[PDB]
Structure 1
Amino acid sequence: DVMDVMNRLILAMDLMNRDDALRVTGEVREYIDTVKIGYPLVLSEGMDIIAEFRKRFGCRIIADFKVADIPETNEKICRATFKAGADAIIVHGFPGADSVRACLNVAEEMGREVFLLTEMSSPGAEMFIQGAADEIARMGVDLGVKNYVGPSTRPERLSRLREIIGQDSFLISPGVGAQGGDPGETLRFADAIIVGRSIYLADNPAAAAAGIIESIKDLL
């Protein structure tokens, strides 16, 4: 019933030029079937990059756009994003339920998925988001959200998120590697890990990906 991510590993492709992004993704293609594409790449190379990734790799694409506007604008963003061929979109929960529902409506209309971001992995998340995160997660459950994002850098917060959403929901988690999160510990709670710089800034991205997978091989 959930998305099936090869090797429980999602590449965060945040390189900002097309040649490098395509080359690095190609180098690791044997290890993944799911790529997270965000604004660094999209605002540098255009939304057409999504269709190009599908043409070259036949990977699923999660548009990490941290959608965080009013309902009317969220609807337009989701429509433009899914028109470009994204399979899923990541939406902030902090702006409230109506803004999430606007995204859920468009995803249902176009055959796509919404991922609800509940607590972020960066230190500043402790200031405002963390105190609201359990409530944001319960809001997700109330709204029928099935896909969530929570922080590798705080395994106790990631475990709590898993507790709230249940074992049947799908949970992906960034902050692995460069931000300090451990792949194996994160996969105790998340279905899949998101990895960016540890792979795409590596001297040998293929070896970097292979190494991460080796470290979690008994979890696959």
Structure 2
Amino acid sequence: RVDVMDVMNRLILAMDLMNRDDALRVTGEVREYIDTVKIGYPLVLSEGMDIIAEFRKRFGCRIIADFKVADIPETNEKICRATFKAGADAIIVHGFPGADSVRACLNVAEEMGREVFLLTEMSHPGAEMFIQGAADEIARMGVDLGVKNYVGPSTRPERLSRLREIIGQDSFLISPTLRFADAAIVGRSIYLADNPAAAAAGIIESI
């Protein structure tokens, strides 16, 4: 779709390593295959938010900040602003705290020309307690907030089809598959391999 982001080869690298040296090396090695990198708090808290600018200046990749923003509106605004100021192209936000908390993020993204991804569901065991039962309503909330980017569950493809049904065929969906999601997120299979470059190439083949 023309109005949503273009992720090279439909493959997003989850760069979950926590030391700067290792993180930069792997990302560079796969830049020929991947143009979009997701980074989270363990890396940025350990190495500093300046690492975002480094990924972009060294490799020219898009950066998605997987910060699972989950505060009150005013604090969400400030987290998003700081994250976008640091150079992130997009930020991942929880829906469980409700519509106003999500809208605060959307407001800053609108101001700064950046993107918000709504996290609709998670697939770790504890997700059954509260997250699973809220997922459809969170997705619908996103639709009613004009959200265009979503992060769906890692497991259970049939959950992915349900999500795709709620959000429509136009919205951008990423998941940790490609019959429903627009891009797949991959981590260990790439950044732990002895040859990250080869791993990415191989995954793209089957894709």
Is the shorter-chain TM-score for this pair beyond 0.5, marking a shared fold? yes
Residue-by-residue CA offset, 1:173-200 (whole Å, 9 max, x unaligned): 02xxxxxxxxxxxx01100001111111
- Distance in structure 1 (CA, Å) of the matches to 2:124 and 2:116: 22
Asked whether the equivalents of residues 81 and 108 of structure 2 are also in contact (C-alpha less than 8 Å), the reply is yes
Gaps of 5+ in 2: none
Aligned counterparts, 1:8-27, within 5 A: 8-27=10-29
- Distance in structure 2 (CA, Å) of the matches to 1:3 and 1:122: 27
Asked whether the equivalents of residues 9 and 34 of structure 1 are also in contact (C-alpha less than 8 Å), the reply is yes
Asked whether the equivalents of residues 101 and 143 of structure 1 are also in contact (C-alpha less than 8 Å), the reply is yes
Deviation at 1:122, TM superposition (A): 1.5
Runs of 4+ deviating beyond 6 Å: none
Asked whether the equivalents of residues 12 and 183 of structure 2 are also in contact (C-alpha less than 8 Å), the reply is yes
Asked whether the equivalents of residues 150 and 161 of structure 1 are also in contact (C-alpha less than 8 Å), the reply is yes
Asked whether the equivalents of residues 103 and 114 of structure 1 are also in contact (C-alpha less than 8 Å), the reply is yes
Asked whether the equivalents of residues 16 and 44 of structure 1 are also in contact (C-alpha less than 8 Å), the reply is yes
Asked whether the equivalents of residues 150 and 171 of structure 1 are also in contact (C-alpha less than 8 Å), the reply is yes
6-15 vs 199-208, which deviates more?
Answer: 199-208
The SS at the match of 2:32 is: helix
The SS at the match of 2:13 is: strand
Asked whether the equivalents of residues 122 and 154 of structure 2 are also in contact (C-alpha less than 8 Å), the reply is no
Q: In angstroms, what is the RMSD of aligned CA positions?
A: 0.7
Deviation at 1:125, TM superposition (A): 1.2
Structure 1 equivalent of residue 31 of structure 2: 29
87-96 vs 199-208, which deviates more?
Answer: 199-208
TM-score, structure 2 normalization: 0.97
- Distance in structure 1 (CA, Å) of the matches to 2:125 and 2:183: 22
TM-score, structure 1 normalization: 0.91
Deviation at 1:107, TM superposition (A): 0.4
Count of matched residue pairs: 204
Deviation at 1:208, TM superposition (A): 1.1
The SS at the match of 2:6 is: coil
Deviation at 1:121, TM superposition (A): 2.3
Asked whether the equivalents of residues 7 and 31 of structure 1 are also in contact (C-alpha less than 8 Å), the reply is yes
Asked whether the equivalents of residues 13 and 21 of structure 1 are also in contact (C-alpha less than 8 Å), the reply is yes
Q: State, as a whole percentage, how many aligned pairs show the same letter.
A: 99
21-30 vs 120-129, which deviates more?
Answer: 120-129
- Distance in structure 1 (CA, Å) of the matches to 2:142 and 2:159: 16
Deviation at 1:124, TM superposition (A): 1.6
- Distance in structure 2 (CA, Å) of the matches to 1:193 and 1:127: 26
Deviation at 1:152, TM superposition (A): 2.7
The SS at the match of 1:69 is: coil
